[model samples]
Target: IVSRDIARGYERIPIPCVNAVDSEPCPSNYKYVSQNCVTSPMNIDRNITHLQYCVCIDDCSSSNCMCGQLSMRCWYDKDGRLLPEFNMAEPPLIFECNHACSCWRNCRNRVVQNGLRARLQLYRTRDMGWGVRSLQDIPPGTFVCEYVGELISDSEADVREEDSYLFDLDGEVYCIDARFYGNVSRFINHHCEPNLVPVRVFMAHQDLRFPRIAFFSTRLIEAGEQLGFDYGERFWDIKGKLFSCRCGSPKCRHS
Candidate 1:
């Protein structure tokens, strides 16, 4: 069974029905159009904007839901089908929401405190290539979002790394290392003066075997500010590595 409801805390912006008349003749910025609904084109090549304010149908799990009349092609597992089901009790993988529910927002902010206003913006970097914007004004010791992705063995990640930029897990290519079951946030990239600092927390066996990865605020960030993490400094020493820092923050290290 499925039900529809207006999203709380968000105002519904009327999607132009005119654009839905012809999917092909629709504006270039419109990704999909059908009936009285339309989806905004994503700015990133591999990413799609999960519309937050639209109506959604629940999939029996509080964490899983879907948007009605909206459709997108999702990657499946090695079995050539979407993962059977999502276990919310466990850390999320590539598809956190249930298959029953297709429409979902990043909601990383809604679940975590003080994240509602934290904007996840995308930017191009001279050295890191492309990455997400970090949250400014983050409070010290606050748990950001958990890194969620496929869980693989270290040896498996090593072997896959030699052949591709992304790791093949189940059937999807994750941005972060495939060796661990974690979040894609690991690929968030780094800046010398990072706005966020990654923190690894070990979960009790009763809770979970793997440790959850998260980031905390290194300093006070202003509103409308870009959030950044020090990827190179945190993971690797940048002694001889050649990469430019385009973060443009005042305290930027690599410049």
Candidate 2:
């Protein structure tokens, strides 16, 4: 139903929203934001005191990049794909080159910061309300997209009417709400055995208190494959009582 580009050029390529289930399409009144936004009344602190920049000439390496020197490893490869070695059950924290860095915009240390690289589309799912998929083949550990939305306090998130689009920060002090505003990443659904994994990445700022969440491909995703991630046990244990799972995986815990 949505014929216009949903991303509206914020992404590297335009993302189309397709609905084939019925004549009607999902709601599109919400604003489309490329990155985390903080409007008035949401008083979040920006502690850039500890944030640092790299001095690599153009490309960055684990040995040369000041951003990765602390960990002695760069998460992404030359093509900005997350290295296979780092795809742990819980991936390590990634620090990408920030705006203050001396490395060029195309630095290998910059994957999540470079924005969405894969061609994504929003389509009406058979069971799930709305789902996202890749239009092209995605390699394992490929950087897909960041979950962008309004940065709100945990207290505010608690009071929000819905928790469907709420992504709690690693710090637990803040959470992101995308129900009213977000990018295509918000359309991704849940799965028991998902192909996408969320990784905490720090860029633009180095505040350990709040690290941005980035989704990486856990396995090779072929064209027209639905993208999904585990929404955590808490979601299904508590608020998910009214909702039923329809992921249709062999390991599906609930349905």
Candidate 3:
């Protein structure tokens, strides 16, 4: 049979994505990084790996950690879907009770860190090429998916000039390049009138440069609707990278 797998811009081989993404989920040891370091001197990334996980004293739910006691609000519903509220300034981080807490793994605040629950697919669209679609209706303010990829340092990311799969967490100085290693989230497209919005989230790490990149739905998204996110105000401004977008919405900002 002919190979019909969707085209990955850089195509990751041994992917350690979430459960239900394809086959059985990879264990916690799933590979989340891509080795781009060269056999040269002063290799900082050689020893560098995905940040170490902090061991919680106990279950995060019952503990008195920052997330457990302070109740850093999560925007998602009980089903892990996003919820809306006024004055959600650029959307805040979905603070989860991490390993440091005494709460159990099933704590309420541990949604994004738990991995994707929604069933989405890699679909090839006529207008926008390959994009992600929800197999189930995703509610507004629910966590949809994360932009998982290679956690490359700012120095290594600097050398990669033109990659569409790179998500620049501008809040941090690093880049999560999904070009060579990523899940279905790497296929999501950009739209001005997007239903999904990217928000910064924190779990174990408290630094600004290392917040997890998770996307949530801004409004009620019907099943089969393609998940979309705004590429940012300056997406079309990148020199030598501008192209016509066919988001197919009457409210397309890029004309």
**Which candidate wins on TM-score?**
2
**Residue 154's C-alpha lDDT in candidate 3?**
67
Clashes of each: 18, 0, 13
lDDT per residue as tens, model 3, 173-226: 767777766656777888879888787777765556666787878888898787
Candidate 1 segments whose C-alpha is farther than 4 A from its true place: 1-119, 123-129, 134-137, 162-187, 202-209, 232-255
Pairs in clash, predicted candidate 2? none
Best candidate, lDDT-wise?
Answer: 2
Residue 49 of model 3, lDDT score? 38
Q: Estimate each model's TM-score.
A: 0.39, 0.91, 0.70
Looking at candidate 1, the ten consecutive residues that score lowest on lDDT are 30-39
Error of 3 at 194 (Å): 0.8
* Location of the lowest summed lDDT over 10 successive residues in candidate 2: 40-49
- Whole-model lDDT, candidate 2? 0.82
* lDDT, candidate 3, at 168: 76
Please rank every candidate by TM-score, starting with the best: 2, 3, 1
